[PDB]
Design an enzyme around this catalytic site. Structure first.
Site, PDB file in Angstrom:
ATOM      1  CB  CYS A 308     109.958  58.625 -55.665  1.00  0.00           C
ATOM      2  SG  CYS A 308     109.348  57.290 -54.615  1.00  0.00           S
TER       3      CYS A 308
HETATM    4  N1  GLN Z   1     107.519  60.118 -53.910  1.00  0.00           N
HETATM    5  C1  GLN Z   1     108.296  60.514 -52.928  1.00  0.00           C
HETATM    6  O1  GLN Z   1     109.232  59.840 -52.557  1.00  0.00           O
HETATM    7  C2  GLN Z   1     107.964  61.814 -52.278  1.00  0.00           C
HETATM    8  C3  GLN Z   1     108.906  62.137 -51.098  1.00  0.00           C
HETATM    9  C4  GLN Z   1     108.686  63.521 -50.500  1.00  0.00           C
HETATM   10  N2  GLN Z   1     109.661  63.762 -49.435  1.00  0.00           N
HETATM   11  C5  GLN Z   1     107.232  63.669 -50.027  1.00  0.00           C
HETATM   12  O2  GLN Z   1     106.843  63.102 -48.967  1.00  0.00           O
HETATM   13  O3  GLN Z   1     106.463  64.327 -50.755  1.00  0.00           O
END
Ligand code: GLN
Ligand code: ASP
Ligand code: CL
Ligand code: NA
Length: 422
Positions: A308
């Site tokens: 991520c």
């Molecule tokens: N790729 C991710 O982990 C994104 C997490 C972030 N908190 C969102 O929901 O945008």
């Protein structure tokens, strides 16, 4: 407003994460541990997004403190809202036979600086950018490099004014996706990103999360694994499905494949982490697997981990090998391989070879492939008898200094087939 453009001149082909990467993109303020940036920069280019010249200097001091290889560090100056570079940076595709392009999209979050960032990425790389008018997120996207992509259902539900045919057509036009596999997310959490439960590890291999029998998502994940195991992949065989057991929501599928290395987030227990790393090592012979502990201040989460917070960057001068391998039982009477090789660096290709071994005898031997027509190379295996076992892989090099094999790792994981003709 989002900058929609015409799609790239065809044919188009989205680049998979397990194809050559020229860099990896991360962002400051950081969401990843400095140990990960150090490990990345040992062998790969790390591009850090910062908002200003002052933030660049702050990052260079932190990298120097941590012993990061500064000779592999570059910067892009752009305003950003977050460190989730996986989700808002551009997607890569080959187009117009020998070019690498960036595809922008509407980031599915109210983060306008993140959403605007891809233009700076294309400018840094010196490549063209195309604007696909879909609400998307890179964490919810993966391609096999042969025209298939998997996304959770939000690819349709967050583009609900378009029909599924219209969404599918945009993926075909901008990314060359001929099978846009949009599935109900099996994970039962808010984020609905494929990278929290699934990951192509190769064109013929997919990793799918597994949970204990009494976990509420057990059956949805078993059904997903069985769906991939039951169907044909790009290489003509059915997918090899590997499973990473999350005993307590460990984000083991949220790994980064960067060239010959695989960075897997680990958060324990140690034996369960070792089991997950050994699934990756089993699935990806010859790759170097690295278990990466999280930063104490921004730990790995079940819905948000290493994949991520990184994004691989394709090679603008990519030496691309397209090959459909000859595998398993082969009826014959001919055993001819073909590979298409294109230099996006516009460099002369020399040589293109088939490395092979018959009945496990000795070492791999190289034979030059025949250039039948520009970019189309062939090789016929001759003198093979019934039950002969062939191991082979493709190698190419060009005058820019690039060197590539198919499969990516080369000799550690060759294609294998058995001759069945008398
Ligand atoms: N790729 C991710 O982990 C994104 C997490 C972030 N908190 C969102 O929901 O945008
Ligand atoms: N705010 C974090 C986590 C969440 O949305 O649950 C992202 O975005
Ligand atoms: Cl809408
Ligand atoms: Na965008």
């Amino acid at each position: 407003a989002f900058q929609e453009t015409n799609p790239p001149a065809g044919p188009v082909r989205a680049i998979a994460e397990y194809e050559r990467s020229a860099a990896v993109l991360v962002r400051y303020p950081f969401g990843i541990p400095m140990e990960l940036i150090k490990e990345l920069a040992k062998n790969d280019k790390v591009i850090t997004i910062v908002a200003s010249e002052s933030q660049k200097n702050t990052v260079i001091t932190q990298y120097t403190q941590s012993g990061v290889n500064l000779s592999n560090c570059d910067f892009i100056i752009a305003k950003t809202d977050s460190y989730w570079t996986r989700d808002y940076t551009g997607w890569f595709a080959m187009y117009d036979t020998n070019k690498v392009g960036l595809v922008d999209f509407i980031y599915n979050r109210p983060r306008p600086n993140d959403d605007e960032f891809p233009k700076y990425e294309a400018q840094y790389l010196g490549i063209e950018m195309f604007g696909m008018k879909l609400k998307q997120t890179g964490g919810n996207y993966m391609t096999d490099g042969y025209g298939s992509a998997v996304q959770s259902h939000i690819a349709y539900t967050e583009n609900s004014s378009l029909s599924q045919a219209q969404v599918n057509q945009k993926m075909k036009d901008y990314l060359g996706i001929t099978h846009h596999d949009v599935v109900q997310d099996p994970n039962g959490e808010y984020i609905n990103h494929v990278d929290c439960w699934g990951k192509y590890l190769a064109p013929n291999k997919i990793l799918i999360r597994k949970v204990p029998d009494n976990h509420p998502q057990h059956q949805a994940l078993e059904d997903m694994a069985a769906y991939f195991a039951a169907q044909t992949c790009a290489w003509g065989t059915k997918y090899e499905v590997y499973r990473a057991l999350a005993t307590n929501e460990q984000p083991y599928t949220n790994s980064l494949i960067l060239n010959n290395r695989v960075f897997v987030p680990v958060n324990g227990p140690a034996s369960v982490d070792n089991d997950a790393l050994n699934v990756y090592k089993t699935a990806m012979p010859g790759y170097e697997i690295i278990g990466v502990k999280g930063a104490s201040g921004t730990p790995w989460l079940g819905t948000d981990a290493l994949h991520c917070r990184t994004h691989e960057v394709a090679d603008k001068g990519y030496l691309y090998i397209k090959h459909y391998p000859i595998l398993g039982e082969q009826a014959g009477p001919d055993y001819k391989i073909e590979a298409d090789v294109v230099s996006c660096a516009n460099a002369t290709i020399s040589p293109v070879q088939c490395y092979y071994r018959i009945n496990g005898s000795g070492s791999f031997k190289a034979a030059d492939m025949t250039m039948e027509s520009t970019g189309h190379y062939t090789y016929s295996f001759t003198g093979l008898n019934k039950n002969d076992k062939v191991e082979y892989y493709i190698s190419a090099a060009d005058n820019s200094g690039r060197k590539e094999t198919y499969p990516f790792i080369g000799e550690p994981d060759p294609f294998k087939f058995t001759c069945m003709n008398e």
